[PDB]
């Protein structure tokens, strides 16, 4: 089996995309709760902001991740801090969102220690990741070509994540790639 040069080159380009915004819908289904959220995801080097709001626009949760750790402002404006964003969100809301892994998956990058399959366009089709006893199955349902430094690059615009009984369906509205 030869190295897939197109896939490896795509990875290097994705690794350049360090400052960006992303908006869309996040559909959450689990045995304990079902939710339909607007999401606003803002990424910069070593930093992440994620706002979830309800279908009427009111804030459900605001997450900030930086070098100090994770900070969540909850729906009722209580403030909580801890070291791991996924664990903190789960303890405060019951929602299981693999925030750390999504920093790679949302762009179409794999994490380390993962299995995956490519599509015929040499980008991710499906991926599996065993993380903290959760076996995540990720499906890249659709890509959209987005301009990056004057070149069209495929980025996910429909992505589904599932582990156990929990599924997260992301549907993208707008990628905004920043200098």
Author numbering: 33 to 211
The authors write:
The mature but non-acylated form of LolB from V. cholerae (LolB-VC), was overexpressed in E. coli, purified and crystallized. Diffraction data were collected, and the LolB-VC structure was determined using molecular replacement. The model was refined to 1.46 Å resolution. The fold of LolB-VC is similar to LolA, with a large curved β-sheet consisting of eleven β-strands that folds into a hydrophobic cavity filled with two short helices. In contrast to LolA, LolB-VC does not have the long-extended segment running on the convex side of the sheet nor a 12th β-strand. Furthermore, the helical segment that fills the hydrophobic cavity of LolB-VC is slightly longer, approximatively 30 aa, leaving 11 Å3 of the cleft accessible in this crystal structure. A Dali search using the LolB-VC structure unsurprisingly identified LolB from E. coli (LolB-EC) as the closest structural relative with a Z-score of 26 and an r.m.s.d of 1.4 Å with 31% sequence identity of 172 aligned residues. For LolB-EC it has been shown that a leucine (Leu68) is important for its function to accept lipoprotein from LolA and target them to the membrane, Indeed, LolB-VC exhibits a leucine (Leu63) in the same position, an indication of a conserved function. Further, the main structural difference is that strands β9 and β10 each are two residues longer in LolB-VC. We used isothermal titration calorimetry (ITC) to investigate if the recombinant proteins LolA-VC and LolB-VC can interact without the presence of lipoprotein as has been reported for E. coli. The measurements showed that the two proteins indeed interact, with a dissociation constant (Kd) measured to 30.2 µM.
